Symmetry: D2
Subunit: 142 residues, 4 copies
Amino acid sequence: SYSITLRVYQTNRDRGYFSIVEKTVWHFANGGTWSEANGAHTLTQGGSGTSGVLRFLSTKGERITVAVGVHNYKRWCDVVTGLKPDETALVINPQYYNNGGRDYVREKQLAEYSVTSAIGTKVEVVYTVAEGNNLEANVIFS
Amino acid sequence: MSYSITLRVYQTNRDRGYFSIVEKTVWHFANGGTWSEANGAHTLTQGGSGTSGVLRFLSTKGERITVAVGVHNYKRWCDVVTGLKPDETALVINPQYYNNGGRDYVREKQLAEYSVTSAIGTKVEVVYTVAEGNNLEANVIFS
Amino acid sequence: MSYSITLRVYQTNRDRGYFSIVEKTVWHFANGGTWSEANGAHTLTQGGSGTSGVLRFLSTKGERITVAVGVHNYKRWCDVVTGLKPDETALVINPQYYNNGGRDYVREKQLAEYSVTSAIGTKVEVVYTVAEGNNLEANVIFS
Amino acid sequence: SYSITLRVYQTNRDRGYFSIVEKTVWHFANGGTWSEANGAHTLTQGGSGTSGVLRFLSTKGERITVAVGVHNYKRWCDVVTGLKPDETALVINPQYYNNGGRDYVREKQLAEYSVTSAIGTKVEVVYTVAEGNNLEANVIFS
């Protein structure tokens, strides 16, 4: 039913280079799958009400997760920084559900969100197509 | 002393369709870990023994299968689950191997190879070509 | 009306080692083209008939093979060259199919399938599962 | 003998998103091969005196090539923009050899080079490790 395509823009050499180290899919709304093409990561979801997380690890050992999904028919996103080596996407993704602590972030149904880690790395998520079933967003490191 | 499990996937029959990875999870025990890819091989680096990771595949015939790889008591193991539901993702499967989640048995068996055939008739075999040391390797085969 | 050739690679025997793509070229006739990848498949989009492209593979046993795919006279063709030299790259191979470069014959045969065995003993078969239309598909098989 | 590893930094959303559409290897110095890992593209060359080219196509139809290699034991690079659809890496790469027209660019043995296409896209190539056998460089779109 829904589709979120992501393209990553690493704009600052000083942050090191980030690469995806995990790709999870939440089991609500009939699950879904991750796919990639032309550098664009797509999360196809079986309906409104589930999500996916992409965890990145930079060349300087920084760990960050990007959470994207659809809540009550409106896209939502989140970015968590300064993650411990054992705080995986498998650990993070479930926290937005069944009162795991981040549920309220999801319900916000944000079309854009940005954060700067404690070590200075700014991560943004902005939806370039925030409406419809074929959503698109950019993930910007700076 | 961390651990690494490198996987190379072999697809042998156009019969069962073409499978592609649709998800990759890392368990949180043993200080976690990460998935990497290079020269067509998938590596799961683990911060030691006691954790694992899962690759979820989807064929062009709509089939969904998962491959679990990890280290139990400094001796590798593997597992394959077939005929998965669309909402039966790796987040549902990977945890079942721990906390009496349903598959702890399989993990404890510390297998260095495993095979099974989905009801749909697809066979998947995981075989560790390097089943000892801190750099284990294995091949994932579809047929 | 451009052309697309989608390739899915099947590796069947740990014997011949594991091959990985080490180069991808596009011939410049027919307004060129581009290589793309998605869901584990490789597509060569061509600005019409009269051009082709090459994938160069390298196994873990140091073997070097190339797969040529293109369209000749609105009818697909393919070719496989084995036992290539380290300096016998796809830039050396792809051009030989034109300008009386040495392999124009093969291209003209407009094959919808082809097989061969390198002296080292590795077999490679390219078979077009969709050999007609503007969206041709084929499987590259190693064994 | 030599190795050039590249990481791509697409810093400006306004340029569209670039993705590699061709990867060629020149046959001099015993050829070589292209490999990738953690978003880093590596060109392993059988010796000093050959090169490789990466051609990119953006979401807005822009075509550009990045040429990297080792000449007389010193790395070199080049970027050609505004390429026609039939001006492929296979067409471009050979032009730096046997007096193909770009030979002089190669002989410069540049450790850094930047150009701005006719449509405003600036492409830079800067070597972060310009010495040794394990060279490294960043490709920056802006």
